[PDB]
Amino acid sequence: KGKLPPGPSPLPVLGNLLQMDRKGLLRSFLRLREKYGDVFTVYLGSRPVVVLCGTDAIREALVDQAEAFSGRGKIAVVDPIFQGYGVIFANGERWRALRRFSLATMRDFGMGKRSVEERIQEEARCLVEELRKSKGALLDNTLLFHSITSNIICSIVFGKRFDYKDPVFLRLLDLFFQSFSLISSFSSQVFELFSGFLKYFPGTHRQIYRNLQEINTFIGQSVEKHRATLDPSNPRDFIDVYLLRMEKDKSDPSSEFHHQNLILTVLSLFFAGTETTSTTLRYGFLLMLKYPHVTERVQKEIEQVIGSHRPPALDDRAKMPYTDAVIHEIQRLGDLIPFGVPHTVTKDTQFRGYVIPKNTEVFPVLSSALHDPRYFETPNTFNPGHFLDANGALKRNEGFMPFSLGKRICLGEGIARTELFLFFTTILQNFSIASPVPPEDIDLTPRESGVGNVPPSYQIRFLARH
Ligand code: HEM
Ligand SMILES: OC[C@H]1O[C@H](O[C@H]2[C@H](O)[C@@H](O)[C@H](OCCCCCC3CCCCC3)O[C@@H]2CO)[C@H](O)[C@@H](O)[C@@H]1O
Ligand SMILES: OC[C@H]1O[C@H](O[C@H]2[C@H](O)[C@@H](O)[C@H](OCCCCCC3CCCCC3)O[C@@H]2CO)[C@H](O)[C@@H](O)[C@@H]1O
Ligand SMILES: Clc1ccccc1CN1CCc2sccc2C1
């Protein structure tokens, strides 16, 4: 008997509830770290979970024993929708199949087809056009940022984008993004522990269910359109490539590529692909308002590398160390997925002298890496310095794992990072920014903190440069 990692003694049913913290799952995990260290077991309701804190511990599991920890566990409030299908929430061979398909696909588009950077560039331009019309007025960029991000996923997945005032677009927008806030509510974190009981009563889970059903409905009726226009020689977008692939194995009643796996993979792409990018952007700008000198510097460097004429492109990034550092530091401080996304182990496992039984849920707490004082002088202060060596060159940092690590690492890292780079720079190229609020009175504490973090809403003006 090697046994489970150390941790508090559970009650039946309640589990470790009486050891948790009212402030949420994260604060709980961090309190428990102080007592039990970087690898402990906490019983969430009746199911035990292994929490990993610190960079070292996270890395040993995810990179070193990469495969043992290649498993994905459920999120209670969304499991009824996903049910183990789609790229995010699938395991074993299904997941292996989907993720291989999902990379390849967005990974090229082809010799005539337009590319993801091209798409993002276009979105950026459309955005700057949109931001001009407001002629320097106070706004709340929340809806715009949700818009540009969803449009990138649409562009990829439906082969079209949507005007920022498109009303039925906006209805679905609103609906879909309300889900994110419900999902990271306190209620949803209680649901995580006790769904087995709360499933019988009204609560956020039902709302989240309806909203995701509505989008699923819309996804499905766009899958139909695509199907009756399918041109097997010029696959326009994601859905097409899938549908063609669905064809191949229509002869195999054991193939993973069917209707259900399609709808939910597309959901998955919006689900994982949209809010975090958007809130990163939103938070970037909040930060640049608190730290004008950074913004100035970012602008100075855009001036030198890109100029005022042409539009930022992706390989401008390798020539813009300070800017890449600011982005990295935005994501780091941002800390938008504090306790990561549930893994499970795929086999009994030895870890630091413990044995973890098959399918036990593992929670890699990325927040504890992003704030690791070994890798970040100043872990709780904004500081592009964390990513710049003495020669103003861009230095990798072991503590920096926002997209997580290993076999499950964010499938959209590439896209995501391009979005951040191109939107940040393209906006900053054409606009100064300002706020009623004085810099040093800009509170940066997140309004809500759950499986995602939300920065405070704030008002900003985008001023002209043209
Ligand atoms: C700020 C931007 C983003 C961040 C910080 C982010 C972060 C993450 C993180 C931390 C995970 C957990 C990986 C794990 O389980 O260990 C994840 C999973 C995932 N992300 Fe992202 N993501 C971002 C944007 C995107 C975009 C734009 C896409 C797709 C277009 C995307 C697609 C995915 C998918 C499909 C998964 C599930 C991976 C799997 O289970 O195989 N993400 N993401
Ligand atoms: O050593 C045990 C003593 O302390 C307890 O007080 C607990 C409370 O009962 C205990 O509930 C409280 O923690 C609150 C847990 C509430 C659950 C919070 C989680 C809910 C799910 C989502 C994550 C958060 O912490 C207090 C101490 O910090 C007992 O209640 C006392 O009566 C007892 O004398
Ligand atoms: O066949 C029905 C119609 O299909 C298209 O219009 C769709 C279009 O797809 C579009 O105009 C609209 O859908 C927009 C919804 C936004 C996409 C959903 C995404 C939003 C973010 C979160 C969920 C994903 O719904 C319209 C319904 O009329 C065609 O463009 C229309 O001409 C046609 O009338
Ligand atoms: Cl669902 C959610 C819920 C609340 C806040 C933010 C989010 C969005 N992120 C956290 C959950 C997952 S799983 C894979 C990618 C992501 C991105």
Cα(299) to centroid(ligand 4), Å: 31
39-44 vs 432-434, strand pairing mode = unpaired
| CB contact burial 101-139 (16+ within 10 A = b; e otherwise) | bbeebbeebeeeeeebbebbbbbbebbbebbeeeeeeee
Rounded CA gap, 454 and 182, in Å? 12
User: What is the radius of gyration, based on Cα positions, of the chain?
Assistant: 22
Nearest to 196, CA basis, from 379, 364, 57, 14: 14
Residue identifier of the C-alpha nearest atom 2 of ligand 2: 18
- Residue 1: count of CB within 10 angstroms of its CB: 3
Q: Which atom from ligand 1 is nearest to the alpha carbon of 337?
A: 10
Rounded CA gap, 275 and 116, in Å? 18
Does the Cβ of 412 fall within 6 Å of ligand 1? yes
SS3 at position 439: helix
Domain ranges of the chain: 1-466
The binding site for heme consists of 410
Rounded CA gap, 403 and 411, in Å? 8
Pocket test for ligand 3, best of 151, 157, 171, 172 (most atoms within 8 A of CB): 172
Q: How many angstroms separate the first and last alpha carbons of the chain? A: 70
Does the Cβ of 154 fall within 6 Å of ligand 4? no
Pocket test for ligand 2, best of 22, 190, 451 (most atoms within 8 A of CB): 22
Does the Cβ of 190 fall within 6 Å of ligand 2? yes
Cα(168) to centroid(ligand 3), Å: 7
Rounded CA gap, 121 and 418, in Å? 9
Entry resolution (Å):
2.7
Q: Which atom from ligand 2 is nearest to the alpha carbon of 17?
A: 17
Does the Cβ of 42 fall within 6 Å of ligand 2? no
Tokens of 445: 């504490």
- φ, ψ dihedrals at 227, nearest 5°: -70, -35
Does the Cβ of 168 fall within 6 Å of ligand 3? yes
Residues facing residue 15 across a β-bridge? 11, 44
Cα(321) to centroid(ligand 1), Å: 24
The binding site consists of 410
- φ, ψ dihedrals at 434, nearest 5°: -155, 160
Q: Counting Cβ atoms within 10 Å, is residue 170 exposed (0-12), middle (13-18) or buried (19+)?
A: middle
Rounded CA gap, 210 and 404, in Å? 30
| Percent of the chain as helix, strand, coil, to the nearest 5 | 55, 10, 40
173 HSE (CA, 13 A, CB side): 23
Topology of the domain comprising 1-466? Cytochrome p450 (1.10.630)
For 397-438, list the strands marked E by DSSP.
Answer: 432-434
